[PDB]
């Protein structure tokens, strides 16, 4: 990995760590729309994203730069904010995990 992609991998490990598990866990795996009874999910969300998919892409060297990695993490949060009413518990959890992400992403080495 490039230096910037090492920083991204560190962020990814933190987002998956026990430290943040209380609010990160809904983002660990793809939304199982059928299992959750969310039969409109794939009509509303055209590009699903989750941390297991970001991890697989990082492991496969899919991300060529930090910007491409960040676009997937933000897509994951944006999907949550698009699908769910803003007062829902899962949106509160998204906001908290995105705060962890944005503050550490901002510490990117130049
Ligand atoms: C113990 O609870 C069972 C349970 N397992 C899971 C697994 N993944 C979930 C993913 C989402 C989710 C995200 C993220 N972004 O968009 C969605 C939609 C999730 O969203 C809550 C919606 C379900 C019904 N409308 C709101 C829930 C997930 C989930 N859950 C439950 C249902 C849950 C509920 C509230 C907060 C977190 C998890």
From Swiss-Prot:
Protein origin, superkingdom: Eukaryota
Residue intervals of the Bromo domain: 1-108
Effect of residue 36 to A: Reduced binding to histone H4 acetylated at 'Lys-12' (H4K12ac)
Location of this chain's protein in the cell: Nucleus; Chromosome
Subunit structure: Homodimer. Interacts with E2F1. Interacts with (acetylated) STAT3; promoting STAT3 recruitment to chromatin. Interacts with CTCF; promoting BRD2 recruitment to chromatin.
Domain notes: The first bromo domain specifically recognizes histone H4 acetylated at 'Lys-12' (H4K12ac). It also specifically binds histone H4 acetyl-methylated at 'Lys-5' and 'Lys-12' (H4K5acme and H4K12acme, respectively). The second bromo domain recognizes and binds histone H4 acetylated at 'Lys-5' and 'Lys-12' (H4K5ac and H4K12ac, respectively).
Protein family according to the UniProt entry: Belongs to the BET family.
Role: Chromatin reader protein that specifically recognizes and binds histone H4 acetylated at 'Lys-5' and 'Lys-12' (H4K5ac and H4K12ac, respectively), thereby controlling gene expression and remodeling chromatin structures. Recruits transcription factors and coactivators to target gene sites, and activates RNA polymerase II machinery for transcriptional elongation.
Additional facts recorded: Some specific inhibitors of BRD2 that prevent binding to acetylated histone are promising therapeutic molecules for the treatment of cancers or inflammatory diseases. ABBV-744, a small molecule, has been tested on tumors with success: ABBV-744 antiproliferative activity is mainly restricted to cell lines of acute myeloid leukaemia and prostate cancer and is able to displace BRD4 from chromatin. GSK046 (iBET-BD2), which specifically inhibits the second bromo domain, is a promising therapeutic small molecule for the treatment of inflammatory and autoimmune diseases.
The protein, known as: Bromodomain-containing protein 2
Taxonomic classification: Eukaryota, Metazoa, Chordata, Craniata, Vertebrata
């Amino acid at each position: 990995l490039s230096e910037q992609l090492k920083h991204c991998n560190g962020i990814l490990k933190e987002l998956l760590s026990k430290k943040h598990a209380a609010y990160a866990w809904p983002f660990y795996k793809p939304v199982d729309a059928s299992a959750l009874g969310l039969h409109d999910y794939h009509d509303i969300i055209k590009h699903p994203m989750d941390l297991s998919t970001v991890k697989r892409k990082m492991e496969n060297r899919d991300y060529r730069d930090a910007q491409e990695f960040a676009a997937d993490v933000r897509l994951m949060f944006s999907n949550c904010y698009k699908y769910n009413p803003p007062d829902h518990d899962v949106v509160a959890m998204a906001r908290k995990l995105q705060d962890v992400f944005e503050f550490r992403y901002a510490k990117m080495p130049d």
